[PDB]
Amino acid sequence: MDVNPTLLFLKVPVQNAISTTFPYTGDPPYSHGTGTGYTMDTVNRTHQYSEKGKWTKNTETGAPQLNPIDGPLPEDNEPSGYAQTDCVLEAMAFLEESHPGIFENSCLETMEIVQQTRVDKLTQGRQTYDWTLNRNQPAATALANTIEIFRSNGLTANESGRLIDFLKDVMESMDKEEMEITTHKKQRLNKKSYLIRALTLNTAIATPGMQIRGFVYFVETLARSICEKLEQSGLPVGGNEKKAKLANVVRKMMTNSQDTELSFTITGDNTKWNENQNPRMFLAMITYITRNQPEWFRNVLSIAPIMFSNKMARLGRGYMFESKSMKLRTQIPAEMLANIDLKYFNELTKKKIEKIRPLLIDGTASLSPGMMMGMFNMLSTVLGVSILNLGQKRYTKTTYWWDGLQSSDDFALIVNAPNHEGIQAGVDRFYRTCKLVGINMSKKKSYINRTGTFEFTSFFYRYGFVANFSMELPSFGVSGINESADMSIGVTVIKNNMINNDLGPATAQMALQLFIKDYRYTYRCHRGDTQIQTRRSFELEKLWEQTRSKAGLLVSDGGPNLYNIRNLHIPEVCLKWELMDEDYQGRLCNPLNPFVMEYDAVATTHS
Amino acid sequence: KNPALRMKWMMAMKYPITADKRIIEMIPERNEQGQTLWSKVMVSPLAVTWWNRNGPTTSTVHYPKVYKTYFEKVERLKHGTFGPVHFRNQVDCKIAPLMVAYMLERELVRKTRFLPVAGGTSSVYIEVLHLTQGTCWEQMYTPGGEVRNDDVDQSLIIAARNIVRRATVSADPLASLLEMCHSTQIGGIRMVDILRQNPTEEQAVDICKAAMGLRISSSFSFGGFTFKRTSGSSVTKEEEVLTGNLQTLKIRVHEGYEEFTMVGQRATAILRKATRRLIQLIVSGRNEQSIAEAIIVAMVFSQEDCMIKAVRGDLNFVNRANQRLNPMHQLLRHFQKDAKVLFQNWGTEPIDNVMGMIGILPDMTPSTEMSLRGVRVSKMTERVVVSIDRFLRVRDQRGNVLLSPEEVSETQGTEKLTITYSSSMMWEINGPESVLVNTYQWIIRNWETVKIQWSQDPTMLYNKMEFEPFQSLVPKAARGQYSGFVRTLFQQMRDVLGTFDTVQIIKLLPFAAAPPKQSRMQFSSLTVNVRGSGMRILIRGNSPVFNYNKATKRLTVLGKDAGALTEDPDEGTAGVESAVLRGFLILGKEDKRYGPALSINELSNLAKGEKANVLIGQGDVVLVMKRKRDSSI
Amino acid sequence: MEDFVRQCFNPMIVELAEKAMKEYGEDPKIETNKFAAICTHLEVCFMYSDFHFIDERSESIIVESGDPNALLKHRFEIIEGRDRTMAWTVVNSICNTTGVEKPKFLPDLYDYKENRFIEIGVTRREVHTYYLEKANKIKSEKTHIHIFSFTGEEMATKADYTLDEESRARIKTRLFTIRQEMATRGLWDSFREEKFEITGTMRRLADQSLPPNFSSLENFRAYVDGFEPNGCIEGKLSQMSKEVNARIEPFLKTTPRPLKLPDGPPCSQRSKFLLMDALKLSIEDPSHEGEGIPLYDAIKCMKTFFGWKEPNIVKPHEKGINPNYLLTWKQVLAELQDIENEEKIPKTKNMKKTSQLRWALGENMAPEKVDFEDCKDVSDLKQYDSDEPESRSLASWIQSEFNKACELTDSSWIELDEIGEDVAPIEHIASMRRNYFTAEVSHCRATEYIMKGVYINTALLNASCAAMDDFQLIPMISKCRTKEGRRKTNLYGFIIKGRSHLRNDTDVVNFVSMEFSLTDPRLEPHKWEKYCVLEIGNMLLRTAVGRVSRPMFLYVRTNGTSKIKMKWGMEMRRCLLQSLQQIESMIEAESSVKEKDMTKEFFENKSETWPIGESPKGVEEGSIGKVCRTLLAKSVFNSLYASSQLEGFSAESRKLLLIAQALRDNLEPGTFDLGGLYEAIEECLINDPWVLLNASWFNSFLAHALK
Known part of the structure; x- marks a missing residue:
């Protein structure tokens, strides 16, 4: 025999054994795509998809800017960013018409959110770009540095603590004629230099600075409030709830799809999603959502697209040149790409550098034409849902009508029609109506098959059964805080992982076994019976001898584990209560210790 | 950061923990073995266990109040009540406010939750969501609320249910049930006594009572559901009927105007019948599904023509132990699996306004103008001698089955008082950590007969049923290879006159109750699986699973006690041990004259009659002599 | 402050209030009044909704016993405690079911009797002022506003109190109790337009960020505010070229095409330790556990072999340093001899830093860093990895590797710990599945690779952290429990670490790996491109005719790894969990379709088989005991041979696999661009042996499935 695991699919349907095809459960030990090359390539691609736009020069920043909106209509089945403002506005007007009051209610809720949110909410995030250091630092450090520099320059409204006051301070800073940055070094940035520093993204392959994040948060809050009311959207939800939507849509399109009405599902994927969405269009739709609203609300919500459309991008670390005849390894920083002779590089990199050189200003590269991944993730979904809403059979005025699900570059479209020509026309109307708004369907990553089976953001649906493989197995190891906290965390991980990320009972039990093994091997607390000889064994042995109710000992006191599925939500010290010896209870939980969702646990001598 | 590796490295170092500066005033500076506990403050982890071992005791009676939430959760679980695991296939205006409420709730479940789920939304259920529901299954689970304080009737009901559910699968149901009931005891009191005294009306308890001949x-x-007759009387005609798939069934149809009060666990009903027709039925339930199932059972019991032709599948059902059940139960189970066809084909007709009784749901949700036939939702004792059949089917003088092992619920409760199931065929109900204890206790309590049969008729002793539960624990892959090995050893205790150790027999006997397989391996430890962990029983020595204390002459199995052992007069005294190696006799202690010790893998190269030393166990060496005569079963 | 509201209210309200605080970014510790107000509002809403149920056409029920009833339903639908998206779903369902204007904001309740949404409030502020403020904020008729007060004052629109007087009295008593307790604690008395302009640089950037035609943000906003759908999509769809279309190419049984694997010299071995060509110098029953000192077992094992001969190079590296690979072994032997002569085991042997180790480790080959200014003229400078995707064709050695990795062994490599009792029936099913799996995979060579990798990476990371500037000799030990119950201590070879000043977790720590083995290099010289294979001994093996002497080889190579790889290898024990998840999902799908627990028809049924092989007879079917190991070996090899090509291929071939599944199911699959999909799949196949083998498996599948 020659073992061929793929041949297993000859017996079990693919969606049943789909887990076989996912190689890793964890972050691989390699970096897939990053560095100066993959950033310059992205810039060049974003500009290429909009090459037939209008070129201008930004008065303040002083960098070339490409404006494809209302550009020539596409002529071939290739990506194009030439979004049409009329088409997008009409689509959003129709979305409002089909869901009356959605925009008004969302705007009111977001407006209430704006006047309360504290600046602290801006530190609960991920790595952020420090305009004061040209580096990346965690959110809290970036916010603290920005606030310190703002105070040193006279801007102090952020002391109020509201995020909107911090935004007002940011806008005032954008108007100052010179910003003084004193680091634990004395430097002064003129208006243009600071403006560039605040309109830059470093290397989701890019993280926005601190000025942008404030407005991005509010824009995405409005986007989330809009999405929560759209059944088509599937971004704001997760876990079991998402599994409902899939079924729901298949039920909507198959209620009476039996009178010869052929139904077909397109499992799709939008090509170059981030490199075609135009921040100018996001402004064009935010100005529509925030209609007949207080001018301050529109002004605050319109400043994220305005800052993106002028955004610059830092290329990256740079290149590394190796001379194998001299055994030399030198590095070229990205800032020197504007003058270095184009002979060292290979042909493809040489072409990339040549194409990007005209856009290089102050070491960055203007990236007006398109958005970058990770930002405006929930506002893009609204455009997609609006497109999906244009197949309601009252907006097509024909016999074919589509309606499906979309989650920001992942969609499934159901195209009920009365015959195959109807299906082939309802797919073309979607692929064409969806090009006018700058969304490019990927023809090499999609497929259409009769309804009853498809894939949507790794939720494989087959004849009513949904397999959820979107999220990965969490690390089932000791947290590393202390003996008491680790048991509480590790067990809770398995519990809430079973609840949210569908995890089998048997695999849950084996994960618990592996966790107990790691726990006992970190803190030397093997079972009393077990003969492992560590430095802590002797004390654990004697304690085993003198305890009559050996079952009540904590797992950290050389006792027996008692955790199965039914009791993963109960803390150890409260699970093993009736089983403890009264003297042992007193000794463990004595307030005279010389020693003493997260970590929900009881305090004992172990802490 | 990677805090896990940091914590491992810290725990590696001595004195990693930071403690108060008063530790010297409380804990010593060295333990009984001279291992230092603290320095300068910095304390080794050994102090954290020294405090728990020898430290200032304190009263902790207040913790259940300080942490009342956690202990409330623990108490809710401890009094839990598990049902069966259900594997579910995922396949202006009038509008009265009550209709609004139904329509709404029925609409939310559609777009709110994916898995159908029966019911439960309060936090008492949400807290155990990781257990109740999964990808494609449900784990029906009644929370451990306060329901009475019997503490004796509950334990009796649990014991009776366990006995019936274990006997229904045995070779002879009635004999096994009588054996189990005559041996089990709850709260010290013997089960038969409480059975005689208790008036409880549980199905399993009533079956057990009928087994003793007591009146029920x-x-x-x-x-x-319990259909207490209230008026009328009739006879069973024992006729035949044909189904939708054209499968003839032999049923017992009734007649006459009969009034039946259907009491239940979570619903009640009043039914009138006359010759296979539902004249008038009233219901009063708790949940929508409770009422649904109540009417399903009532209609199945009505034996109506429309009900019978409503079948849309194969009426083939299997009881545990591969039995076919009865046609009435077949129809009931089929119509419990599927509901819509039965209800829609049952028929519908208009209602007349009556006090406090809404019309049934024709489907899904109730109605106030039209209801299914003669069914209306609403609100608001003697002993006869019986006889049990072989398949625990209680019957009356009329011959109509009253109680059967299918009426007993699957509700696996938790015993309140301590229930001891003395007898085999039930040591599996308790944890697998108890099967070993009970097996060894049984082997000891019957030591005389076991010894006689071992020395006279070993094969019948090996093929004994009392060792079957033990065979569940032993790994399947090596289940047989052990037997052969052990069997061979025992033969070498019957051939080599003078060698006889009781402890070895009582230790290795249960391992020799499987079809033997021959191999050339010299086992050092026989492994047995308990609670997912593979413990070992050493062939020569003491193990946590089996420790024999010569001083007190007592056997301890997994910490618990097994009993005491006497000494056979035939017990060998020369020290020669024969059942420790496949073809060797351990002639005594280390003998440096014969040379350095041989690993147990090398002694297989010794020729007949050769003698050498071998490392036979933990830092131990013994002299072994190869047997010239080779013995095998 | 922080204690009362915590204690007097049930926890659920506490978590709800904290969730609201996180929503607004607020912290419970920083503030008191907002938390107290939120908890009070939540409790008031719940006690209003928990008032009582409905009945048949009479409503206004006042029953509170605890027995649910079908015809008795809650009169008030909770909305405050419901999730945002789900709350909007509920309110939309209300509006669709019965005609009532959608409230601008999320209300608190939906009393069914009056069919009117109910918004409730409670605050110390003057009742009339609060009611007017709420009427202004929640500005809509056909709704209800109900305002309470701690002082004992209530109000509602139209003076039409919905519920009964007794329940209102209960609410007032609860409020009075709260206020009185708070006042007795010094808490009660503690409780007592927007402008944003775009000007200057932001105005000039907003006017510069519009659609081409427009000039100023004011003009753009004026246009947008006056937009009305006039059929703009229709005209532009009419004007757009007909070539912009997605024609559905049919996908038939003949369309599928075998993938095109690369062409070139055969692929070479890439792992970090010999997988199947591994020989162990194991000792039985080392003597009591306790993680025996690795360097003591590494000597007690090498004392078990007496066939050491003069090392001889049988296969050179052919682009490397052979003599210094030989001398590193001849120095390891000497160092191990010195440990024996010394008293007590050092517990860590730092190797003498000599030219042999420096060169073998590559420390003397690494290029020196130079600033670009100095090396401008050097003509050999080129972008690193300028072009080296050398394509290498598939070889059979990887298939043999997997074949041997799917086989049983005579040992027990994974010894898991215990679990609590199994009470719930679902617990019984889970335990049955887990026990069957662990029995089928405990004895297996995939588990041997898992544990060997875990041990090696752990002992390498620990030494790389502790001793950062020493060449520390590291044995490659593993421990198993033989089928007879006696523990062993296998030694596979040695690892010599190099300088390990790892600051960022991507710096490489070059190390020399020297494995023992019996597999002659000359049989597959193309598989050992990266190794320098020696001949170190002559081992006697039990052949059929007598006992034959066969050579014992040592495989030497200068490898390198970083903290990320070490951490990814130390967790290889997750391969068991991944494989168990795969098997259990396979069981769960079948059970769901079959409406019963298929845990038995899978594991205990000697007839069931799955096609997982291919022999000259045809497709070969194994038993569940072979699937459990095949999937485990597949996962272990995904972890060992992890690469970007593997991820790309697995992502891109799953779409083709699903199209094939749709075809086999007769769903009339159709693709918009299949050539692009095939090109994407074949772009990943370059030189990775594992991905090439996977592509070959895919070809074989397609061939058998669509035939």
């Missing part, structure tokens, strides 16, 4: 109620149990 005349009520008729069916589909989990």
